């Protein structure tokens, strides 16, 4: 039976949708997208879901906003009905072959409802809450029968029955346990018609307080979240997540005479995978047309490589070719997948062996902070079980499996066991992890670029000795590292005063919105995995330095929209340089193998990607070989 | 009526059944109709499985359209709802079932004679109703229609000996055949005929799953049949036939296993391929329910396209986590396509023959096949020749005393870094239908053994094999051979000599069969070859592990000007264009190489006196040469009777590659040449 | 949940309604009527009900017809929904201030479903049956709450609840005993808002087998009929009725463990009051424009009175002025209701005293058969309790109360007790029955015209004696009779042969569709209380004679659309004739009182009504006085 208050709220939300035109634009775009590939194929179908900004709702109608936040069961169904009515009103051109219920998702500032699994108590029940946590368990995506269609052969007629549970609606119904129809009303045997029955995907994930904010030494708190038909498979275990949903109570909690307390869970409305450092979530960024224009504008510059090289770690003094190599690894080459099935690696590995305090770990931490997807590990702090996969009858991804299509920053690389070393041997060239353990023969993808830091045998790189004795690493392992940089802390007066002036200038830095003696606050930077190009603060005083967010945008653009093709004019340089490096006797820091030809190719491709060029020209090969010759010998030609 | 409302669907099953019957009777484009030929074969009991091609149905519909007749889309209806059309096609076949031209004899199956008996019994009961009503004297159409109302006959599913399967319509000959990942199979695809591409990870034993359990009643003499649909069933206690139900003294009825309907049941587990899993995800598995004659067509490690009806099952998880009518899902397998056809299932059909002659007539089969193994790897021709010989393998000899000779070639590639030993291992794994790539000191400690567990489907303790067991009658490519545990090394020793793994541990005492060819890749002592040091010194293989390998290559990376120039041109061409540089030489497609090697493995060449005399002389000269250099800085470990059998195995493999039955002098020449050049890279 | 079969039947009945345009015409007429007096008054509102001819449905779709007749619960709801959809489709102009459910009523040939309460067995259950019987009990028209509207003062909000019973739908629901809401969901006290709640009239009548067709000496059979919101008050006790409805079974019949058998009754869809002779149901007749044209055409004739006089009882020979008086009584005068409250009678009473076999009873039986509403009684066969009202704490109408606005044919008037005579005295002039018995002081209306037949004292009217001694009736009683006719069986040869030739010609009569020796069949003429003018069979062989149905149509038209006004030119004749009759000494058959002035006035008005004249002219008064002088003396002037 119709409710006057329900209709009043429906028309109020219709007024809200009319006021903010972005929601008709979103619904219209979704409908035209669905119709266009429906007619095209007689890709994927976008869900009937709209992101609603709670700030705009508060601006429009504060009580509707407070009603949704505090009494969602009475305000969300009317708003969803209004959205569905609006969508069916604009649906003048129906999809080929009210109706099509549209769901709502919420975003914005939740205030006191933005909680965690620890702070989510029983006085938040029946409220729209945003819970931030870590996904620890993801159940199987199971179909749920919401409508069963049967066939009666004697009458030749198709019947159906709709099913309802306590979690499909925000309000409580009268429970109607309608049985599965095994026969008609008048005795005819029914045959279930699979493919005409309706099954809805259902998942139940567990969100636990994030380790970065959970109290140390205390047992963590968890909360159940239920996802239905479009939020399933939106996250994976170990993901940082922000789930917006209604904190519901279900069952009777032992009152109904046939539990210790009422069964509580979150009916998920929105799932946002969050980006935290050293996690398995990549960093999607929004690239406006202005950002792309600036990226192309800077790519037109000749010295853009240098501009990108110095802007990586201005705080670190020097380490300029190391920064060039780090930028090239951030871009990386393009992997080759030949038709027969073979794989050519397109990821660049870097090793930095050096004396104490030459900033190898700060250069690792910077890469961890700025990379799209980076996992930080330490030698012997993570084993092969912790680096590669692990069998739990089920597999748990390790450091280098979560970092697939990403970067692995390994500090204290020398303090790594040989059992880990063999797994690392497999991961670096073939980019795969073969388990073959306890009846689980699986080949996980570990297409990751490894950057590592190491110390010499005696703790100080002796220039009198040779590198092979100063490294104490297997030669086969050192071959996998595309670029091996030996950094030595030479005491020279010019660079001594220059590095000290830099260190002090960096220490004498103030944020734009801070006082002289105000302790700088620090948050954990839980970015959402979806305004000037250059940097005001320049530790060096000189070319221009771009901001780290803009550098990340540039790296993302070049990494996702540029796939350079090798050219003969680059091949001549690459082949000549490889032949010289193989045959010339120079007492190289690292050996020269066919892997050296491919690090030449990969670095040339990466530098071509830096310039946004779709073809690797001669200059790219020359600069790649230049960096390689520096890395092998120390030349400055 | 108000409850259980009726819905109007665009599916009319009466004319769909009529179209099914017309297609079965009239389709002949693949001397007469293809399907009645198949039903005639089934009637005479040469065939127990009916595979309905969706390509045939699509072609029939296209022909009907071309002649102007409007035909309902049977293919789309089958794809959308496949469970009903198995039921439909079975009824249609039963209607058009030809009479058998062969009488029942004593060499027929017990099921066949049971079905014949019940068919004759039901026809006799029809005739008996008819005669009784005629004697009662109360048109033959009405008489018949009364008879089938007063008869309790055996239903057609009890007089049914064949199994029905739906082969998906080919992509080139085109929804049910486009391969889907395990993730891509959502609940929208439930109830449809879909194809999933994956790798099989666990197959259960073929068990008898009851479908229609039969009982006999000693009171009324009836046979009461109860259909079984779920995991568990409750047996009947009192008879439910007409006589006992009408009477007051009911009869207690006993099970009849021979009269019950059983199905060969397997529950396989398919898994996502590495190319299908998204970034940072763990592959998820899917349950495949294999029934009927389709069993034993899936084995662990198989990369297959499995086409079946995606069907729901009752929930089996925790009851407290059930929110609604949650259902488990499985794939009722209907068709299996093997990406890598097994060497055992090779048949010399016409198309296989034409391809083999087009390979042979091109000439230079040995070198073409060797150079086609990883064609982007450059300049390892003796290496690729030895790998091809390993793929073909020698001729297994069982002496009458019960002795067995291995017949399989183990090849060890010890070399410097960056020489493509690991790339050659994955090439062999790709070529081999049963190839297992493992890395030493990874997680293969249990891999080079089998682990005893419980089968979840069937309440048994079964030991699931690992790397050396899953690669049985195949190839195990072991990378980083010099970095395994002692137990793994001993297991490799046993596998390479006796082709078995003897396990005597707490809970198990078995001798596993591992007929595996071992292709090992190793790094020399210190990771780089020191030519100053002795070859045996730089080889970290016990004289007994080294002895087992039929060939041991020493792939050394010496710098040069022309050789390095040529490798770099090849690698850089491969990087520009995803293909090898040479235009004169065209590599053999890996599927056509597997077919040639499968054909070659069917030959068992023998050695004559004139060839084995030279084999003896060469063995003597090799032994003398090995004796003359025991520590001369070029010692490879002295020759052994194992080198003679390796020479013999290589000669037999080379003879097989020629598709010959005589082991000729050319093959022994090439075997000696390969053994000699296995070690010339040192010089 | 929608049903495919329900929609198929809805669209089939929509096709049926489109094919037969009369149903859109009826629905459109009903809607425009409702809108027109809705806007007029910001009379009565026609119900949303349509008469459906089952013959037309059988012509259109025989299975839909058989489905309605045999399975009404599955075919009547879809047809009603189709009618409602059609009505709301034509409702382009809504009434001032789907919706408005339209009900269906059925008419036509029912075949085996046309039954009686005796022949209505349990194998007619759940079938659409037409039952003919007599109404014996009519329960109170009680309101039934179908929607209760409540007000919550704390929230100031209006709530409602709909109620459903087993008799409101043809199909069986799940019973939902929703309680009367005495409070809101959250504890607020509710106040019932009468006048906003919805009450539907409900009546339960009992239909018993009609006495004319029930077996003699056997206990009659009865059936319950339930009428809802427009069929209530359509009948009264004693009415012959034809009820079309679904023979429903209700309850559990003792199976539900908490009756001897299942409770069965008829859910009335249609109520037709039937016209049977000597019953309380008048005879509505359909007057087409052709009938009215013929009536006016004949009224233009001068001798129409004679044409109507001879056509009354052609079978009776003679009795011509008696027939004129009978026709005038059938028309009658116009009653006067003065402002102070007094009443002047406009009904004409006739008494016929005569010898045996002068057709007094045949002239009574003819009046019973042809009158619009006539009740036949016999002296001492009905007492004052049987003639006037009777107290049962409730009143039961007698012969002269049921015959209100009708005719009472009393045979054997002389054999009537004086206790009845006093009540008849009251009924004839004041036209009322005052009970004043057992605490029931009631004045029932008995505005009836009395025609009576009587025999003399000695059985033969002695012409030697005077009328006052030959009648033996009270003089005050004879004054009430407007026209007293003394008929004597004089043996005269001319009229002897003429009456005998007439009697034989009447006996030698054959119906148009009968053989020479075929026994004429005879039905009970159960006319429905809603083609030539003249008669082919003429016993006299002469003016033309009109058919009895056409004469009934003419009497109905003149009686319902003509109200003559007296004129001075008629008053002069009336006054002169009355003065002469009062003063002239002629030994009148009946006394002359002021009632004689008013029988002159009434007869003049009746004759004016015969000519369809709205004014009583001089000729009407002259002919009235002529008939009166004949009736008093026997003159032929
Ligand atoms: N070349 C350099 N330029 C700037 N800061 C430096 C440099 N070398 C060392 N530092 C500083 O030294 C500190 C320690 O460096 P760290 O990265 O921990 O050294 P290591 O690589 O030996 O672990 C940091 O605060 C870092 O900024
Ligand atoms: N002869 C060769 N031809 C082509 N590529 C080669 C050759 N030798 C080495 N490579 C390249 O060297 C890279 C590393 O070789 P890999 O097989 O991993 O080394 P190893 O076998 O020594 O462990 C591969 O990407 C491969 O393409
Ligand atoms: N004048 C008459 N004309 C025609 N039929 C007459 C006449 N008088 C008597 N009858 C016949 O006499 C029969 C008996 O008449 P009835 O009405 O019973 O007489 P009464 O008035 O004495 O009771 C009827 O069949 C009637 O037709
Ligand atoms: Mg450090
Ligand atoms: Mg390797
Ligand atoms: Mg009489
Ligand atoms: Zn029995």
UniProtKB/Swiss-Prot annotation, chains A, C:
Enzyme class, UniProt record, top EC level: hydrolase
A GO CC term attached to the entry: DNA replication preinitiation complex
Compartments in which it is found: Nucleus
EC numbers for this chain: 3.6.4.12
Keywords: ATP-binding, DNA replication, DNA-binding, Helicase, Hydrolase, Nucleotide-binding, Nucleus, Phosphoprotein
Ligand binding (ATP): 354-361
Subunit (UniProt): Component of the MCM2-7 complex. The complex forms a toroidal hexameric ring with the proposed subunit order MCM2-MCM6-MCM4-MCM7-MCM3-MCM5; loaded onto DNA, forms a head-head double hexamer. Interacts with CSM1.
Any further remark recorded for this protein: Present with 35100 molecules/cell in log phase SD medium. Early fractionation of eukaryotic MCM proteins yielded a variety of dimeric, trimeric and tetrameric complexes with unclear biological significance. The MCM2-7 hexamer is the proposed physiological active complex.
UniProt protein name: DNA replication licensing factor MCM3
Protein's organism: Saccharomyces cerevisiae (strain ATCC 204508 / S288c)
Gene: MCM3
Included range, full protein: 16 to 742 of 971
Curated annotation (Swiss-Prot), chain B:
GO biological process: DNA replication; DNA replication initiation; DNA strand elongation involved in DNA replication; double-strand break repair via break-induced replication; nuclear DNA replication; pre-replicative complex assembly involved in nuclear cell cycle DNA replication; premeiotic DNA replication; silent mating-type cassette heterochromatin formation
GO molecular function: ATP binding; ATP hydrolysis activity; chromatin binding; DNA replication origin binding; MCM complex binding; single-stranded DNA helicase activity
Ligand binding (ATP 1): 378, 418, 420-422, 523
Name of a matching Pfam family: MCM
Note: Present with 166 molecules/cell in log phase SD medium.
Subunit structure, as described in the record: Component of the MCM2-7 complex. The complex forms a toroidal hexameric ring with the proposed subunit order MCM2-MCM6-MCM4-MCM7-MCM3-MCM5; loaded onto DNA, forms a head-head double hexamer. Interacts with CSM1 and MCM10.
Catalysis performed (reactions): ATP + H2O = ADP + phosphate + H(+)
Domain of life: Eukaryota
Subcellular location: Cytoplasm; Nucleus
Main function: Acts as a component of the MCM2-7 complex (MCM complex) which is the putative replicative helicase essential for 'once per cell cycle' DNA replication initiation and elongation in eukaryotic cells. Core component of CDC45-MCM-GINS (CMG) helicase, the molecular machine that unwinds template DNA during replication, and around which the replisome is built.
Species per Swiss-Prot/TrEMBL record: Saccharomyces cerevisiae (strain ATCC 204508 / S288c) (Baker's yeast)
EC number per UniProt: 3.6.4.12
Record keywords: ATP-binding, Cell cycle, Cytoplasm, DNA replication, DNA-binding, Helicase, Hydrolase, Nucleotide-binding, Nucleus, Phosphoprotein
GO cellular component entries: chromosome, telomeric region; CMG complex; cytoplasm; DNA replication preinitiation complex; MCM complex; MCM core complex; nuclear pre-replicative complex; nuclear replication fork
Similarity comment: family membership: Belongs to the MCM family.
Binding annotation for ATP 2: 548, 642
Protein name stated in the entry: DNA replication licensing factor MCM7
Span of the annotated motif Arginine finger: 547-550
Residue span, MCM domain: 365-572
Designated gene of the protein: MCM7
């Amino acid at each position: 039976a119709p409710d006057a208050v329900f209709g009043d709220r429906v028309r109020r939300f219709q007024e809200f949708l009319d006021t903010f035109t972005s929601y008709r634009d979103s619904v219209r775009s979704i409908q035209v997208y669905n119709s266009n590939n429906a007619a095209n194929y007689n890709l994927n179908i976008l869900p009937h879901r709209i992101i609603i900004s709670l700030d705009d709702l508060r601006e429009f109608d504060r009580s509707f906003w407070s009603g949704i936040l505090v009494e969602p069961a009475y305000f969300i169904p009317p708003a969803e009905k209004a959205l569905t009515d609006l969508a069916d009103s604009m649906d003048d051109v129906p999809h080929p072959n009210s109706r099509h219920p549209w769901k709502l998702s919420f975003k914005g500032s939740f205030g006191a409802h933005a909680l965690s699994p620890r702070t989510l108590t029983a006085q938040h029940l029946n409220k729209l809450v945003s819970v931030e946590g870590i996904v620890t368990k993801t159940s199987l995506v199971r179909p749920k029968l919401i409508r069963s269609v049967h066939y009666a052969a004697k009458t030749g007629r198709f019947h159906y029955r709709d099913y309802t549970d306590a979690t499909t609606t925000l309000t409580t119904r009268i429970p109607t346990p309608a049985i599965y129809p095994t026969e008609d009303t008048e005795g005819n045997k029914l045959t279930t018609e699979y493919g005409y029955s309706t099954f809805i995907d259902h998942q139940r994930i567990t969100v636990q307080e994030m380790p970065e904010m959970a109290p140390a030494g205390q047992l963590p708190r968890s909360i159940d979240v239920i996802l239905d038909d479009d939020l399933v498979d939106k996250t994976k275990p170990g993901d940082r997540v922000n789930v917006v949903g209604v904190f519901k109570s279900l069952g009777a909690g032992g009152m109904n005479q046939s539990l210790i307390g009422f069964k509580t869970l979150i009916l998920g409305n929105t799932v946002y995978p969050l980006h935290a450092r050293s996690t398995g979530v990549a960093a999607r960024q929004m690239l406006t047309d202005f950002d792309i224009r600036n990226i192309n504008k800077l790519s037109k510059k000749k010295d853009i490589f240098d501009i990108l090289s110095q802007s990586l770690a201005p705080s670190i003094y020097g380490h300029d070719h190391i920064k060039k190599a780090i930028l090239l690894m951030l871009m990386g080459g393009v992997e080759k997948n030949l038709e027969n099935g073979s794989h050519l690696r397109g990821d660049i590995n870097i090793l930095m062996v050096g004396d104490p305090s030459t900033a190898k770990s700060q250069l690792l931490r910077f890469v961890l902070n700025t990379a799209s997807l980076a996992i930080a590990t330490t030698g012997r702090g993570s084993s092969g079980v912790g680096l590669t996969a692990a069998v739990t009858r089920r597999l748990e991804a390790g450091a280098m499996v979560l970092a697939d299509r990403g970067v692995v920053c390994i500090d204290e690389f020398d303090k790594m066991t040989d059992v880990d070393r063999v797994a690392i041997h497999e991961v670096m060239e073939q980019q795969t992890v073969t388990i073959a353990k306890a009846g689980i023969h699986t080949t996980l993808n570990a297409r990751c670029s490894v950057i590592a830091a190491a110390n010499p045998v005696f703790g100080q790189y002796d220039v009198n000795r040779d590198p092979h004795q100063n490294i104490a690493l297997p030669d086969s392992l050192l071959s996998r590292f595309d670029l091996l940089f030996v950094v030595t802390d030479d005491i020279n007066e010019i660079r001594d005063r220059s590095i000290s002036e830099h260190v002090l200038r960096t220490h004498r830095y103030l944020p734009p919105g801070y006082l002289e003696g105000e302790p700088v606050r620090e948050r954990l930077n839980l970015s959402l995995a979806v305004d000037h190009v250059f940097e005001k603060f320049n530790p060096l005083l000189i070319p221009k330095l771009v901001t780290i967010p803009f550098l990340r945008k540039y790296v993302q653009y070049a990494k996702e929209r540029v796939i350079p093709q090798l050219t003969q004019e680059a091949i001549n340089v690459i082949v000549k340089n490889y032949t010289d490096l193989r045959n010339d006797d120079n007492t190289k820091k690292s050996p020269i193998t066919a892997r050296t030809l491919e690090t030449l190719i990969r670095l040339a491709t990466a530098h071509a990607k830096v310039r946004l060029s779709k073809t690797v020209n001669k200059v790219d090969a020359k600069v790649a070989a230049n960096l390689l010759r520096f890395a092998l010998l120390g030349e400055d030609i | 009526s108000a409850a259980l409302p009726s819905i109007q669907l665009p599916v009319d099953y009466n004319n769909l059944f009529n179209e099914i019957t017309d297609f079965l009777v009239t389709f002949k484009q693949d001397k007469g109709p293809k399907y009645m030929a198949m039903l005639q074969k089934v009637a005479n009991r040469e065939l127990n499985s009916v595979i309905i091609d969706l390509d045939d149905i699509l072609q029939y519909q296209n022909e009907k359209f071309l002649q102007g007749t409007q035909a309902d889309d049977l293919v789309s209806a089958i794809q959308q709802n496949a469970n009903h059309f198995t039921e439909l096609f079975c009824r249609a076949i039963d209607n058009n079932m030809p009479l058998p031209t062969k009488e029942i004899d004593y060499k027929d199956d017990v099921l066949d004679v049971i079905l014949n008996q019940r068919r004759l019994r039901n026809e006799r009961m029809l005739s008996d109703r008819t005669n009784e009503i005629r004697s009662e004297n109360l048109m033959n159409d009405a008489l018949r229609e009364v008879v089938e109302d007063e008869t309790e006959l055996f239903p057609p599913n009890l007089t049914r000996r064949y199994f029905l399967y739906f082969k998906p319509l080919s992509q080139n000959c085109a929804i049910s055949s486009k391969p889907l990942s395990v993730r891509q199979i959502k609940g929208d695809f439930l109830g449809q005929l879909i194809t999933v591409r994956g790798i099989i990870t666990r197959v259960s034993d073929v068990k008898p799953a009851v479908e229609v359990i039969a009982y006999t009643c000693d009171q009324c003499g009836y046979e009461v049949f109860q259909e079984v649909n779920s995991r568990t069933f409750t047996p009947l206690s009192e008879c439910t036939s007409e006589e006992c139900s009408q009477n007051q003294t009911k009869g207690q009825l006993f099970m009849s296993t021979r009269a019950s309907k059983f199905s060969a049941f397997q529950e396989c587990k398919i898994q996502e391929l590495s190319q299908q899993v998204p970034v940072g995800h763990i592959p998820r598995s899917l349950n495949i329910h294999v029934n009927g004659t389709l069993v034993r067509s899936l084995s662990p490690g198989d990369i297959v396209d499995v086409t079946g009806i995606f069907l729901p099952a009752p929930y089996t998880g925790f009851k407290a986590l059930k929110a609604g009518l949650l259902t488990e899902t499985y794939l009722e397998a209907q068709f299996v396509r093997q990406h890598k056809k097994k060497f055992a299932s090779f048949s010399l059909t016409s198309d296989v023959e034409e391809r083999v002659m087009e390979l042979i007539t091109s000439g230079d089969v040995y070198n073409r096949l060797a150079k086609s193994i990883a064609p982007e790897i450059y300049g390892n021709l003796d290496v690729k020749k030895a790998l091809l010989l390993l793929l073909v393998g020698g001729v297994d000899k069982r002496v009458g005393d019960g002795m067995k000779i291995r017949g399989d070639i183990n090849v060890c590639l010890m070399g410097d870094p960056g020489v493509a030993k690991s790339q050659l291992l994955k090439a062999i794994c790709k070529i081999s239908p049963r190839g297992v790539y493992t890395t030493g000191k990874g997680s293969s400690g249990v891999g080079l053994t089998a682990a005893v567990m419980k089968d979840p489907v069937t309440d048994e303790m079964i030991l699931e094999g690992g790397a050396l067991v899953l690669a049985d009658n195949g190839i195990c490519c072991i990378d980083e051979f010099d970095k395994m545990d002692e137990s793994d090394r001993t297991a490799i020793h046993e596998v390479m000599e006796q082709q078995t793994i003897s396990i005597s541990k707490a809970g198990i005492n078995t001798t596993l069969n591992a007929r595996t060819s071992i292709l090992a890749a190793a790094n020399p002592l210190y990771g780089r070859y020191n030519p100053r040091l002795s070859p045996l010194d730089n080889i970290n293989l016990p004289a007994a592990l080294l002895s087992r390998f039929d060939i041991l290559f020493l792939m050394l990376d010496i710098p040069s000007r022309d050789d390095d120039e040529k490798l770099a041109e090849h690698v850089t061409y491969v990087h520009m264009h995803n293909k090898q540089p040479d235009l004169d030489f065209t590599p053999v497609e890996p599927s056509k190489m597997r077919e040639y090697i499968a054909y070659a493995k069917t030959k068992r060449p023998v050695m004559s006196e004139a060839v084995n005399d030279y084999v003896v002389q060469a063995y003597i000269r090799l032994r003398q040469d090995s004796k003359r250099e025991m520590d001369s800085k070029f010692s490879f470990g002295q020759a052994t009777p194992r080198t003679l059998l390796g020479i013999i195995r290589l000669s037999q493999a080379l003879a097989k590659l020629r598709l010959a039955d005589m082991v000729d002098i050319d093959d022994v020449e090439e075997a000696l040449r390969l053994v000699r050049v296995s070690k010339e890279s040192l010089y």
